DNA sequence: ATCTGGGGCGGGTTTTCCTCGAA
RNA sequence: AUUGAAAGUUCUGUUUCGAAGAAAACCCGCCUCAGAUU
């Protein structure tokens, strides 16, 4: 299990919308409960959805899987991620539907061989015999840091025109700036492993053979999100990202580091790691820290220089 | 017993749900009566049910029990907590239904030797000779702090789209952010102890042999609930939790600490505990406290640093 | 005597139920006539029967009596309060039925030496020679405050499901919130005193040797009701209680303070007690008050911080 | 400080289960 | 002060035990506030 927390800094940005009113495009905003000296307050703040990062991760995964020779589905060959939700996707792909519960495992394995994305990202098929498979990577919204008494985020509107020579052409676009943060989780101890209960079926040998390649590709995929390649409306509103602080941890037991809200969240997670290992009887716990803002770190933890090093270390 | 109150601060989550209408998901909400500066009011507020916590705790218990070698049932090997209620579960597990009341103790012991969950989580079998075993852990809904006049909570809806290349795929999801608090109860003096009244039957010696391990595992299992690992929709809506304040108490007599609504429930509960012992003539009464929001505590009480230390000390 | 009236604030609660319909579990309800500024309205409101409170009190009494060293019956040691109604209870307990009227008194003594519960709570025996004994503690339903024209109380349904892997399991439960109130009476000058008229019988001396202990235990047993331990469905719906106002009166003459339906029920009851002492030729009268909602009280009263102090002073 | 432009379109959810028993 | 006068149908009892609405998905593909002035 690889878990992590990341702090980005974004200026003059619009990477997600919700709808439009009149001739105005709306950024995504949501409530937050914040703590200050006086007490508890409710504020509205711009956020970036969690399904605008899963899409980027899955796209990078598809690209790398195609480049390295691993199988990739038909619909997912194009960047459409209906996977196998409905009967039409199955018919196009070329798989048969489950007959009864006993056969369910069979079907899954087939689906889990044709398309890599349906394996690391989970899926759901609804029919007379439904089948489910939860994701192997988990994500959440991207909120700015709820630190201190002043949220360091701003939102505004801008006025734009479309030139013409025969007037008979004006639009307003929302733009935001923030100190974003988020956290992520990936469990590599279940990749290429059926999640349904039943007797053994043929074809699992190929899965056992491909497990190493699949895990390596999935780990490599995270470089997309960690680098800052995601979101929409990038053509004319390319943002200016920058990495401030990152903490990642590899363990054998469930564990989640502190959110990036407080200035001192590197130290607390490191301190808690060893005690968690002791209480839960673990056998491996390592932590990697990337720091550029100059805050408290701790002791007995690696210090890297760039994200590219972390991917290599995780692969090793 | 071990009884405690906990205060949480969650942002932008959707943990519990209920039936949906149209293309919109629903977050569990309930009515609450609140005291104001002008009287008493009825409000509607989001709430996280009390059985999601039970499922998370029992899943953690299953994991640790299987890790440490304690017996675990067959159906409960998978996470299907029907337990020995319906006849099909007994038939799968291989136990004969009781004949008369005189056989109740035999059935209870035989079931309790096969499944730790059916022991530390109670169970019920309905039939000609009904058998009951009340839970040894007790939990309730998770309500936001009913303090003052302004409830610190907020619930909104969000817009999501499933992109495609051949339009012919839109949904809305509710998202909340609140300051959650809840209380929990447990009793270690009844684990590995048959409840029904009868004559000693063989095998209870083994029950007495494993009591220490069962109690240790049950105490360890709480770390899952205390660390923030529960609820659904965690794949794409991973919350951002944080622990503000916590009080836990180990005693020898019935005792329920003050809810975490008012600002000062630590000093009040410690003062009440100081006198309850003398009132009921106990012999052990210890209190542990974690304080991050800087509220009134008292003097001469333990001040821990995390939840791992609390679990370690409770184990000792 | 000791009389009292108490006010509670309960949220997200289900402590009493009745016959169910379909997959719906119901909360007990009853009619109430409320006088509003427009007239006399009739409403339906959730109520909790008094026998639940009686059962909780008697269970606490059994626990304390066993722990202190007073006699306790055979069946009642297992928390089954049939007392001595039917012949089977006598046969298990090992006592002889009365023959005729003149012998009845003897019966009442023996049963009153073998079980403190049959002493405090009374009993009945249908048969040739009835032996009645009115309870020494009296309680009534728990109705929410009828202050004003807007009753603070709400009753809703909630939806729950049982997970399974092979569908072939859905239930609904009623949850409530309200501001409850209830009143209680307990005359301590009739404990350990035969209540049937006849000649003296041996063993009454032993009864008189334990009167102090029996009375003290009966007083201590009220800590349960005054702390908030009663009802059912406490395993998964642990309610969040809190005490707001309480009035207790210790006297030598019949008295019944004001029902806690009006914001000013403390001053009125204090004045009524003051005048009743004079009118009834009484000799002792004291009033204790616990006040947490900051309402008007009066002058010349004792204010207690918690229930522990109240029980201590009642015992002293 | 004088004008003129002030948005267009495709999509607006699919499944599985709807209470067991003692009085 | 009347078919009136004289009377309690009263005592004893839990609806209790257990069960995740969970799994899958991008609001996104195009546009300039431009021309003249001490």
DSSP track, A45-63: EE-B-SHHHHHHHHHHHHH
CB neighbour class for C96 (10 Å; exposed up to 12, middle 13-18, buried from 19): exposed
Residue C308, min C-alpha distance to chain B (Å)? 6
Give Cα separations from A118 to A77, A81, A115, A209, C1 (angstroms): 12, 9, 6, 18, 75
Nearest to B179 among A33, A50, A280 (CB): A33
Distance CA A27, CA A155 (A): 9
Distance CA A185, CA A138 (A): 5
CB neighbour class for C253 (10 Å; exposed up to 12, middle 13-18, buried from 19): middle
Secondary element (H or E) of residue B174: strand B170-178
Phi, psi of A155 (to 5 degrees): -140, 140
Closest Cα partner for A27 from A244, A186, A177?
A: A177
DSSP state of B48: B
Q: Which chains have 3+ CB pairs within 8 A of C?
A: A, B
DSSP state of B16: -
CB neighbour class for A150 (10 Å; exposed up to 12, middle 13-18, buried from 19): exposed
**C162 CB below 7 A from strand D atoms:** yes
Residue A124 in contact with partner chain B when CB distance is under 8 A: no
**B133 CA – E12 C1', rounded, Å:** 28
End-to-end Cα, chain A, rounded Å:
15
- Write out which nucleotides of chain E lie closer than 7 A to a protein Cβ: 10-33
Is the backbone of residue C300 left (phi > 0), alpha (psi -120 to 50) or beta? left
Closest Cα partner for C115 from C145, C89, C153?
A: C89
CB atoms within 10 A of CB C120: 24
Closest Cα partner for A45 from A142, A183, A190, A182?
A: A142
**C55 CA – E14 C1', rounded, Å:** 6
β-sheet bridge partners, residue A185: A3, A138
DSSP letter string, chain A = -EEEEEEE-EEEE---EEEEETTEEEEPEEEEEEE-SS-EEEEEEE-B-SHHHHHHHHHHHHHHHHHHT----SGGGTT---TTSSHHHHHHHT-PPP-STTTHHHHHHHHHHH-SHHHHS-EEE-SSS-EEE--SEEE--BEEP--TTS---EEEEEEEE---SS---EEEEEEEEE-EEEEEEE-TTSTT---S-S---TTHHHHHHHHHHHHHHHHHHTHHHHHT---S-TTT------EEEEEEEEESS---PPPSSSS--HHHHHHHHHHHHHHHT-S-EEEEEEESS-----SS-EE-SSHHHHHHHHH-
Residues 6+ apart with CB under 8 A from C200: none
**CB–CB of C214/C192 below 8 Å?**
yes
Closest Cα partner for C74 from C56, C90, C86?
A: C90
Give Cα separations from A105 to A92, A102, B9, B61, B76 (angstroms): 21, 7, 40, 27, 20
Residue C228, min C-alpha distance to chain B (Å)? 9
CA dihedral A22, A25, A30, A36 (to 10 degrees): -100
CA angle B281, C209, C86 (to 5 degrees): 85
Give Cα separations from A206 to A110, B42, B279, C105, C156 (angstroms): 11, 60, 69, 88, 53
Give Cα separations from A164 to A122, A167, A168, A235, B65 (angstroms): 49, 6, 10, 22, 73
Closest Cα partner for C64 from B253, B49, B285, A256?
A: B253
Distance CA A61, CA A82 (A): 16
Helix axes B308-315, B211-227, angle to 10 degrees: 160
Give the closest residue to E20 (Cα–C1′). B52
Phi, psi of B156 (to 5 degrees): -135, 175
Distance CA A145, CA A263 (A): 10
β-sheet bridge partners, residue C250: C2, C286
Q: Going along B16-169, which residue ranges are E strands?
A: 18-21, 24-26, 29-35, 40-46, 123-125, 131-133, 137-139, 143-144, 153-161
Secondary element (H or E) of residue B5: strand B2-8
CB atoms within 10 A of CB B51: 18
DSSP state of B77: G
Secondary element (H or E) of residue B12: strand B10-13
**CB–CB of A184/A4 below 8 Å?**
yes
DSSP state of B2: E
* Residues in A touching C165 (Cβ below 8 Å): 101, 197
Distance CA C179, CA C8 (A): 6
Nearest to B238 among A30, A139, A258 (CB): A139
CB neighbour class for A16 (10 Å; exposed up to 12, middle 13-18, buried from 19): buried
Distance CA C228, CA C48 (A): 13
Rounded to a whole number of angstroms, the CA Rg of chain C reads 22
End-to-end Cα, chain B, rounded Å:
15
**3-state class (DSSP) for residue B4:** strand
Distance CA B84, CA B107 (A): 11
**CB–CB of B1/B250 below 8 Å?**
yes
Q: How far is CA A98 from the centre of its chain?
A: 30
Q: Residues 93-152 of chain B: which lie with beta carbon within 7 Å of strand D?
A: 124, 126-128, 130, 132
Q: Which of residues 64-123 of A touch C (CB under 8 A)?
A: 101
Q: Do A197 and C166 touch (CB under 8 A)?
A: no
Residue C168 in contact with partner chain A when CB distance is under 8 A: no
Closest Cα partner for C8 from C248, C293, C302, C312?
A: C293
**A236 CB below 7 A from strand D atoms:** no
Nearest CA in chain C to B29: C158
**3-state class (DSSP) for residue B246:** strand
DSSP state of B235: T
Phi, psi of C18 (to 5 degrees): -140, 180
Closest Cα partner for B125 from B139, B111, B137?
A: B111
DSSP state of B142: B
Residue B261, CA atoms < 13 Å, CB-side half-sphere = 21
Nearest to B183 among C220, C238, C244 (CB): C238
**C20 CB below 7 A from strand D atoms:** yes
* Residues in C touching A101 (Cβ below 8 Å): 165-166
Q: How far is CA C225 from the centre of its chain?
A: 7
Distance CA C103, CA A228 (A): 95
Phi, psi of B78 (to 5 degrees): -80, 165
* Determination technique used: cryo-EM
Distance CA C82, CA C121 (A): 11
Residue B163, min C-alpha distance to chain C (Å)? 31
Phi, psi of C232 (to 5 degrees): -150, -175
**CB–CB of A184/A6 below 8 Å?**
yes
Closest Cα partner for C287 from C267, C306, C307, C305?
A: C267
Give Cα separations from A74 to A116, A270, B196, C222, C243 (angstroms): 11, 44, 60, 72, 65
Please, what sign has the CA dihedral across residues A115, A120, A126, A131? positive
DSSP state of B223: H
CB atoms within 10 A of CB B180: 27
Distance CA B30, CA B47 (A): 6
Distance CA A91, CA A87 (A): 6
Helix axes A266-280, B308-315, angle to 10 degrees: 30
CB neighbour class for A295 (10 Å; exposed up to 12, middle 13-18, buried from 19): middle
**CB–CB of C153/C178 below 8 Å?**
yes
Residues 6+ apart with CB under 8 A from C241: B256, B259, C8, C9, C10, C228
Residues 6+ apart with CB under 8 A from C2: C185, C186, C187, C188, C219, C248, C249, C250, C314
Secondary element (H or E) of residue B11: strand B10-13
β-sheet bridge partners, residue C2: C186, C250
The closest nt to B118, taking CA to C1', is E18
Residue B246, min C-alpha distance to chain A (Å)? 17
Per 3-state DSSP, what percentage of chain B is helix, strand, and coil (rounded to 5)? 30, 25, 45
**CB–CB of A193/A212 below 8 Å?**
no
Nearest CA in chain A to B294: A37
Distance CA A82, CA A92 (A): 12
Closest Cα partner for C251 from C276, C275, C285?
A: C285
Nearest to A279 among B163, B240, B308 (CB): B308
3 state SS for chain C? CEEEEEEEEEEEECCCEEEEECCEEEECEEEEEEEECCEEEEEEEECECHHHHHHHHHHHHHHHHHHHCCCCCCHHHHCCCCCCCCHHHHHHHCCCCCCCHHHHHHHHHHHHHHCHHHHHCCECCCCCCCCCECCCEEECCEEECCCCCCCCEEEEEEEEECCCCCCCCEEEEEEEEEEEEEEEEECCCCCCCCCCCCCCCCCHHHHHHCHHHHHHHHHHCHHHHHHCCCCCCCCCCCCECCEEEEEEEEECCCCCCCCCCCCCCHHHHHHHHHHHHHHCCCCCEEEEEEECCCCCCCCCCEECCCHHHHHHHHHC
DSSP state of B101: G
Closest Cα partner for C48 from C198, C232, C292, C303?
A: C232
Closest Cα partner for B16 from B240, B239, B246?
A: B239
Distance CA B238, CA B13 (A): 7
Distance CA B189, CA B166 (A): 64
β-sheet bridge partners, residue C92: none
Q: Residues 127-186 of chain A: which lie with beta carbon within 7 Å of strand D?
A: 127-128, 130, 159, 161-162, 167-172
The closest nt to A57, taking CA to C1', is E26
**B137 CA – D18 C1', rounded, Å:** 29
Q: How far is CA A100 from the centre of its chain?
A: 34
Distance CA A104, CA A98 (A): 6
**CB–CB of A58/A64 below 8 Å?**
no
Give Cα separations from C184 to A168, C85, C265, C277, C309 (angstroms): 83, 25, 15, 20, 19
Distance CA B84, CA B90 (A): 6
Distance CA A276, CA B306 (A): 10
Residue A274, min C-alpha distance to chain B (Å)? 10
**CB–CB of C196/C131 below 8 Å?**
yes
In angstroms, this model's resolution equals 3.2
Q: Which of residues 208-247 of B touch C (CB under 8 A)?
A: none
Distance CA C42, CA A108 (A): 60
Residue C12, min C-alpha distance to chain A (Å)? 23
Distance CA C207, CA C221 (A): 20
Q: Do B42 and C159 touch (CB under 8 A)?
A: no
CA angle A289, A293, A296 (to 5 degrees): 60
**A23 CB below 7 A from strand D atoms:** yes
* Residues in B touching C152 (Cβ below 8 Å): 33, 40-42
Distance CA B279, CA B163 (A): 67
Q: Which of residues 284-313 of A touch B (CB under 8 A)?
A: none
**CB–CB of B90/B97 below 8 Å?**
yes
Distance CA A74, CA A91 (A): 11
Residue C171 in contact with partner chain B when CB distance is under 8 A: no
In this structure, chain C runs to a length of 316
Q: What b/e string do you get for B260-290 counting C-beta neighbours within 10 Å, with b at 16 or more? A: bbeeebbbbbbebbebbbebbeeeebebbbb
Nearest to A40 among B12, B179, B236 (CB): B179
Nearest CA in chain C to B198: C78
Give Cα separations from A198 to B62, B81, B221, C158, C165 (angstroms): 20, 19, 29, 35, 12
Give the closest residue to D14 (Cα–C1′). A126
Closest Cα partner for B92 from C166, A99, A100, C161?
A: C166
Distance CA A53, CA A185 (A): 13
Distance CA B90, CA B232 (A): 29
Residues 6+ apart with CB under 8 A from B175: A30, A141, B12, B13, B14, B27, B155, B156, B157, B158, B237
**CB–CB of B284/B250 below 8 Å?**
yes
Residue A49 in contact with partner chain B when CB distance is under 8 A: yes
Phi, psi of C229 (to 5 degrees): -105, 100
**A163 CA – E32 C1', rounded, Å:** 7
């Amino acid at each position: 299990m690889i878990s992590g927390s990341v702090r980005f800094l974004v200026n003059l940005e619009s990477l997600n919308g919700v709808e439009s009113i009149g001739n105005l495009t709306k950024h995504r905003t949501a409530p937050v409960v914040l703590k200050t000296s006086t007490g508890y307050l409710v504020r509205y703040v711009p956020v970036i959805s969690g399904e605008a990062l899963a899409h980027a991760y899955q796209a990078s995964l598809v690209d790398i899987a195609k480049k390295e020779g691993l199988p990739v589905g038909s619909l997912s060959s194009q960047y459409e991620f209906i996977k196998f939700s409905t009967d039409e996707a199955l018919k196009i792909e070329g798989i048969k539907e489950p007959k009864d519960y006993n056969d369910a495992r069979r079907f899954e394995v087939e689906v889990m061989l044709k398309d890599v994305i349906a394996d690391v990202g989970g899926f759901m098929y609804a029919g007379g015999a439904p089948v489910r498979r939860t994701s192997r990577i988990k994500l959440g919204y991207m909120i700015p840091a709820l630190r201190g008494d002043e949220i360091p985020a701003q939102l505004e509107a801008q006025f734009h025109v479309r030139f013409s020579n025969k007037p008979v052409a004006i639009f307003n676009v929302e733009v935001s700036s923030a100190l974003y943060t988020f956290s992520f989780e990936l469990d590599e101890d279940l990749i290429a492993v059926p999640s349904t209960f039943g007797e053994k079926v043929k074809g699992e040998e190929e899965l056992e053979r491909q497990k190493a390649k699949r895990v390596k590709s999935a780990i490599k995929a995270l470089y997309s999100l960690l680098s800052g390649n995601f979101g929409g409306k990038r053509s004319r509103f390319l943002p200016s990202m920058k990495l401030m602080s990152l903490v990642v941890t590899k363990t054998d037991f469930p564990f989640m580091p502190e959110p990036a809200h407080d200035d001192d969240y590197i130290k607390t997670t490191i301190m808690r790691l060893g005690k968690a290992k002791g209480v839960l009887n673990g056998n491996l716990a390592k932590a990697y820290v990337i720091n550029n803002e100059g805050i408290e770190v701790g002791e007995g933890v690696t210090v890297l220089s760039t994200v590219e090093d972390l991917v290599v270390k995780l692969e090793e």
